[PDB]
Amino acid sequence: TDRKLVVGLEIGTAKVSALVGEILPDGMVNIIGVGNCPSRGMDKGGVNDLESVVKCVQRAIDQAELMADCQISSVYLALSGKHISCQNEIGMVPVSEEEVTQDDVDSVVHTAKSVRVRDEHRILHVIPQEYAIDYQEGIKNPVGLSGVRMQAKVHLITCHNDMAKNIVKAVERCGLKVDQLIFAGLAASYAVLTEDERELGVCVVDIGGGTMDVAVYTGGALRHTKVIPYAGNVVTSDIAYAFGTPPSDAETIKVRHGCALGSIVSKDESVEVPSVGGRPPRSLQRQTLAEVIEPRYTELLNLVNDEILRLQEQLRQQGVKHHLAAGIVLTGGGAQIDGLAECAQRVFHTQVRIGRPLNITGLTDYVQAPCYSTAVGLLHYGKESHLG
Ligand SMILES: Nc1ncnc2c1ncn2[C@@H]1O[C@H](COP(=O)(O)OP(=O)(O)O)[C@@H](O)[C@H]1O
Ligand SMILES: [Mg+2]
């Protein structure tokens, strides 16, 4: 008769995004409300001023609430940060009456997640990877099948206990309930990935301001989750230091004229820059600016490439699919720079594409930017939370 709504909120380093979407019978999300606000009160270490973030959240909430003609009461909250980690466990149970029932599934996943976890961490996501019923490896939906012993591979995403307290207080002080805390990198791949790319094998890199969220899917299952604490802010620091310009201006010139490949930028495109110390403005070439951006971006993607390969090795020792036939998907705000899909192709030596949010309709023009990957992914994750 009506409409099922899902609202996602991302309190980022520079933007606070609130998205309102309808669940359609398709499985697509009809985005009917957008809310943007400059994220005031958050360092990269986290929240430094609660009252500022409360006004920021309710501002973004009020705009999307009015644009959608609804009443937001609960949200799906994103969560980024340095102290996010992962681990993989393996459980095994005797199959009840030699036919896999739901209680068989629930206990083997329970015995996998009931393990010692990284010092000062709690389980944020319990994601089963695949099941093995009597040496039929790689089973996704195993309920109903026959067998004696069943193995389950479960992927655990863990986070520090306190790293969410501030942003939960911020949202709760706006009269809103937190439906669930979602890892930002997880929601990102929910938005930019197709299901066949997970089957073929892919690696998503959510490139924000302070973190690079990396997820690796092989054989249709999430294999790895890694947070690298170096992103677009380190690139901005290079421009501010290599040219002697305020970081507020180094951020402007990077988004306005930056490029990850000095190979493709012309020699006659010249940019102007305000200098520090009240000293006269300087004039540099777009190519020279790209010659500063390229070494850092290459170094960052090599950190991801180094993480992909050593994971691929350990997967080879375990007899699990490992090849990334779908390639690399770079997403996030830091992935929107020119020439990046080409700079990454020289690093990973495979197909690279810049992914935007998928599977959406309505106000798609407002959230089609790769920086909206996490925000849209909160809508899809919450949609899957409903139908289940
Ligand atoms: N057109 C662009 N070119 C290069 N970098 C960009 C561009 N747009 C945004 N960025 C970078 O992306 C980062 C912000 O991405 P975002 O996903 O909003 O961060 P977070 O996930 O931490 O909130 C900033 O560091 C910014 O410099
Ligand atoms: Mg982002």
Author numbering: 5 to 392
What do the study authors state?
In E. coli and many other bacteria, FtsA is the main membrane anchor for the cell division ring, the Z-ring, which initiates and organises division.
The EcFtsA1-405 and XpFtsA1-396 structures showed single protofilaments with a “loose” longitudinal contact between the IIA and IIB subdomains.
